[PDB]
Design a protein around this ligand. Structure first.
Ligand SMILES: O=C(O)[C@@H](COP(=O)(O)O)OP(=O)(O)O
Lengths: 462, 462
């Protein structure tokens, strides 16, 4: 049972919009919207979306496993050894938000202050004393972006696993000599850093120049969660506000995916005429180039939707029905929709590019979609008494911590290691006003709901 | 009753070190150390200090008022109008942490997300609708450091008031025409930005080239809090760990101030021989140039303590008894004292340069001294039922908010406006492990105390 199995199981359920059935439904943690800061829904005038892992949630482990295979195939074709072909994606290893230390070749799970929670070199989990050899203070400076790369997106899950597979393979292959900062193969030295760069380049290539998009679109049922409640929720949002799409993807891909997500023999509700995905949006913007989008952005372009090419020149005209934009900036959206930042609820899965930057740069309200939560909630609930045991204790503490963490996977929970919260968890609490396993959970709350969080008090104020 | 009156009242009290008298004492909020994150004192191997507003707490409003007078005198001498001489420092206006908007000439009190809590143009407090004219989303991008300057230090209190005095004077003087971004005086245009720069330059000049230091040192009793418990606490720290001083000040000034702080006819306890301030430190570093100190730093120099000049050249020798260093970096301290970051408790008043940067860059443990807390606690306690009233209500809400805030001053509490926490309050919670009105409050806790904060849980985990 992957998180996308949980999500698709929920998607297969028709909507019962009886006011009491809705209240009853959002009692289950799985269908709730979780609140970091209060948000009066009646003040929200525009709902904005990212596509990838928001509207189009890719099925797991199938989509990660396809990315992994194509990245491996790309590395082998540029001259990495044949043995790479014998790797197979393992969804029980990677947790999102890990840091790759490019100097020493370690994956690290860290808290918000750069304290090390987990260190693995390949598939060897390094304990306390040995980690102090490389990290004397058990601490990394995460502003050292040349050395440390944070694998924060769901697109980075295959490469998280692949980095560990590579370190493991080269360490154990007698053709290579292991050094502190990489591997010697006779007169060739491959540093962890240049290995990491090859991996990152091959992932980029696979998405932009390779076969990933082609293979996705030829089997959408296999790769993409589909839900009859999607048109229903978007149509209800459009009744009370404007709705926009701002995606990094190009028009052709977006049109293929979105067509699929809306491909029902009815519109919003069963019985209603089907309508094209585009009619659900007051504004559609592709090639957004987020996070730059939330600063200077790029020049505003117009898509020729017949060819899928951009028209030549900067677009200087008004918002017209049927027009599709490319590039631009967050100010474009505000100007064209007549919105102030605080009137906008922006819905995305990228805790940096989407959510952090629209909050810090523009004061947008934010809803983070966290697909893994659909399964982390099930673990959190039926290891209730394991965390409670941990909480009661403050040697047994390290053991309980370990067994709590293993229930999630080899790299533990997205949100913690025992009683120590992750960097990812702290970015969520600080920058996501609202969050959930799916934005569909909004359907379970009335139009003008006040999501409420308790007022925060300092220690001297308590 | 200023906060430094509270502090000096407490300093005049001899230490009763009876174990039960200590427990009883730290029951009072005024003598407590407040905990944002747990800290086992037994793990602390080095205690590090800043001097200014930490060891040497300048008396208020006297010291601010002296800075204000000398800054005014400096502005007048470079050609600002004579009317400036009729300004008088008013300690009831400025609150620390305000933002000066150099485009529009406003002081702003903001939360951690850049939302505006208070806007004043000169001495006119601008209400909701009028503020939306300049701040359509009631929001500033605080990463716009060219436009916005944050007045975060106690040294910035005189200039906070002076900026408002200047805007007020030029607005109401018929020689000048008020414009959106400054003042026209015939064929001369003075922008708020260049006015701000003049003020900032004159404050800098007053500290580095003017008479502020001279006037301080000629009347130390008037300007600097002195406490017999200081030598006592430092001596107790030295029994269990190393103690260091790392200050931005030069040697001559530091020697004058520190000599005064230790000028008792006894050492640590009454009855004991007096010892020189320098014997209380395993390492003394002046001209630290923080915050750069916590990165590359500067070249390590040696002070010639006879002349107060630097010896010529980079110092390459060991830590020797009696040596005084200049410049260097945080790594110098760690290397010479044989400390890891987490073994260090760094004690300072600058929530950015001291505390933020040693935490983020080096993983040091942090103790923030917040002098105003010595008085904000007294207001928090006897407006108990005013905040409680505010808490019960969630038009009356705006009124209660206003009357709560006025008890603190015109720009309200350092920590909030009603139920909305300030940027400053959020920087404290996130980067200060421990905080208090004075670091002397450490004297009330045993050697190996565990300061404890409850574990943090996300909303879905609660
Ligand atoms: O969260 C962030 O975006 C940064 C910046 O904080 P601000 O200076 O923008 O408040 O804090 P970090 O997590 O790196 O300590």
């Amino acid at each position: 049972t992957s998180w996308s199995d949980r999500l698709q199981n929920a998607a297969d359920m028709p909507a019962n919009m009886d006011k009491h059935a809705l209240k009853k439904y959002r009692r289950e943690a799985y269908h709730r919207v979780f609140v970091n800061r209060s948000l009066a829904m009646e003040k929200i005038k525009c709902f904005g979306f990212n596509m990838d892992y928001t509207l189009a949630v890719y099925k797991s482990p199938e989509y990660e496993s396809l990315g992994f295979e194509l990245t491996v195939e790309r590395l082998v074709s540029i001259g990495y050894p044949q043995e790479l072909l014998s790797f197979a994606y393992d969804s029980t290893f990677p947790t999102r938000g890990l840091v790759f230390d490019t100097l020493y070749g370690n994956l690290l799970k860290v808290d918000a202050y750069g304290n090390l929670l987990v260190c693995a070199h390949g598939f060897n989990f390094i304990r306390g004393p040995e980690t102090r050899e490389q990290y004397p203070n058990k601490f990394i400076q995460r502003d050292d972006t040349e050395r440390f790369y944070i694998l924060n997106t769901l697109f980075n899950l295959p490469e998280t696993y692949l980095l560990a597979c590579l370190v493991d393979f080269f360490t154990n292959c007698p053709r290579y000599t292991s050094c502190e900062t990489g591997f010697k193969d006779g007169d060739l030295f491959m540093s962890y850093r240049s290995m990491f760069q090859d991996v990152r380049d091959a992932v980029d290539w696979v998405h932009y120049k390779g076969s990933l998009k082609e293979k996705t679109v030829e089997n959408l049922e296999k790769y993409v969660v589909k839900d009859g409640k999607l048109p229903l929720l978007l149509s209800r949002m459009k009744e009370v506000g404007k709705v926009f799409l701002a995606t990094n993807s190009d028009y052709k891909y977006t049109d293929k995916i979105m067509t699929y997500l809306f491909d029902f023999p009815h519109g919003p509700k069963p019985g209603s005429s089907h309508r094209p995905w585009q009619s659900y949006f007051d504004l559609i913007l592709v090639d957004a180039r987020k996070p730059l989008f939330f600063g200077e952005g790029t020049v505003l372009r117009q898509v020729d939707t017949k060819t899928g090419k951009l028209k030549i020149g900067t677009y200087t005209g008004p918002l017209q029905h049927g027009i599709v934009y490319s590039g631009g900036s967050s100010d474009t959206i505000c100007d064209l929709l007549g919105a102030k930042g605080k009137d906008i609820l922006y819905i995305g899965d990228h805790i940096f590019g989407d959510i952090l930057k629209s909050k810090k740069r523009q004061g947008w309200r934010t809803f983070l979609v966290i697909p893994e939560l659909a399964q982390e909630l099930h673990v959190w609930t039926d290891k209730s008494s394991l965390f409670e045991e941990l909480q009661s204790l403050d040697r047994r503490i390290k053991k309980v911590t370990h067994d709590m963490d293993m229930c999630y996977g080899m790299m533990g929970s997205l949100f913690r290691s025992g009683s120590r919260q992750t960097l990812f968890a702290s970015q969520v609490m600080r920058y996501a006003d609202l969050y959930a396993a799916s934005f569909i959970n909004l359907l379970y709350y009335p139009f003008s709901y006040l999501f409420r969080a308790a007022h925060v008090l300092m220690p001297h104020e308590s």
